Amino acid sequence: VSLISALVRAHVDSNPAMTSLDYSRFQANPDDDTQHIQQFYDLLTGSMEIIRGWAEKIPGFADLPKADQDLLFESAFLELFVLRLAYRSNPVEGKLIFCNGVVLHRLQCVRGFGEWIDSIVEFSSNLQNMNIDISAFSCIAALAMVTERHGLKEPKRVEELQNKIVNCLKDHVTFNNGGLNRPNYLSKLLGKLPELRTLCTQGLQRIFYLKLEDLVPPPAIIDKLFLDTLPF
Numbered sequence: 033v034s035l036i037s038a039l040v041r042a043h044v045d046s047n048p049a050m051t052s053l054d055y056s057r058f059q060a061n062p063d064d065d066t067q068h069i070q071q072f073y074d075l076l077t078g079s080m081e082i083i084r085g086w087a088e089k090i091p092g093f094a095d096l097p098k099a100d101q102d103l104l105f106e107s108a109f110l111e112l113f114v115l116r117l118a119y120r121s122n123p124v125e126g127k128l129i130f131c132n133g134v135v136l137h138r139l140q141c142v143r144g145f146g147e148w149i150d151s152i153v154e155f156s157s158n159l160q161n162m163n164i165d166i167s168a169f170s171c172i173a174a175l176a177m178v179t180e181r182h183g184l185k186e187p188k189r190v191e192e193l194q195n196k197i198v199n200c201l202k203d204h205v206t207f208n209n210g211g212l213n214r215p216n217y218l219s220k221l222l223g224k225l226p227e228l229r230t231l232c233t234q235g236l237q238r239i240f241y242l243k244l245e246d247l248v249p250p251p252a253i254i255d256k257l258f259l260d261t262l263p264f
């Protein structure tokens with residue numbers, strides 16, 4: 033199996049299928065609930081598990097020390113939640129498609145996600161305007177996780193894996209352009225990664241707000257990851 037094939041499989045097998053989406057909760061025009069907050073947390077915790085399975089399907093990832101795996105996964109989690117949500121969704125219709133296949137309107141997400149959902153949809157729109165095929169996306173997603181972080185036990189190995197993925201992506205882009213390079217396109221593509229950082233911080237801000245509001249406290253796994261991430 034080629035590396036890009038393995039990256040595509042990791043992506044496809046960790047995303048809901050277009051042929052089995054769940055519309056049973058969707059409302060194009062719905063009518064503060066503790067319910068919306070709870071669901072917001074459920075969507076984050078359900079997504080953690082699926083992204084963890086995705087990460088374990090990236091060749092080389094399971095070869096890293098357990099601490100390195102945890103560091104990479106935990107540091108990238110919210111970025112990945114946003115990236116994959118934005119790729120899967122239908123921003124023009126205001127349709128968010130979560131990793132379990134549940135389709136919800138933007139207006140349904142507003143009570144749980146606050147403003148952050150609006151930032152997500154905007155980024156989705158910008159991302160989809162770039163016409164990133166499945167193979168290129170699979171590489172980009174991997175690169176949001178397989179990246180330099182401070183305090184890795186095997187940073188050279190992470191860097192080699194990063195470089196292998198970058199080279200897949202490069203060859204893929206060039207091949208799909210009939211053998212000519214697209215170095216500016218590749219730049220714009222990799223430029224989507226720094227933009228995920230802002231979206232991550234906005235997700236942290238939402239959890240911060242909900243924790244302070246204290247109507248529904250975050251569940252232990254979110255609380256722990258949230259608190260451990262804080263510089264204070």
Ligand SMILES: *C1=CC(=O)[C@H](CCCCCCC(=O)O)[C@H]1/C=C/[C@@H](O)CCCCC
Binds near residue numbers: 255
């Ligand atoms: C995503 C972007 C962030 O702002 C956050 C890093 C936090 C900033 C730490 C200070 C910078 C430094 O000095 O190193 C990243 C969040 C990652 C997130 O997945 C952590 C777990 C989410 C909790 C639910």
Ligand SMILES: [Cl-]
Binds near residue numbers: 079082112113117131
């Ligand atoms: Cl996800």
Ligand SMILES: [Mg+2]
Binds near residue numbers: 264
């Ligand atoms: Mg403190």
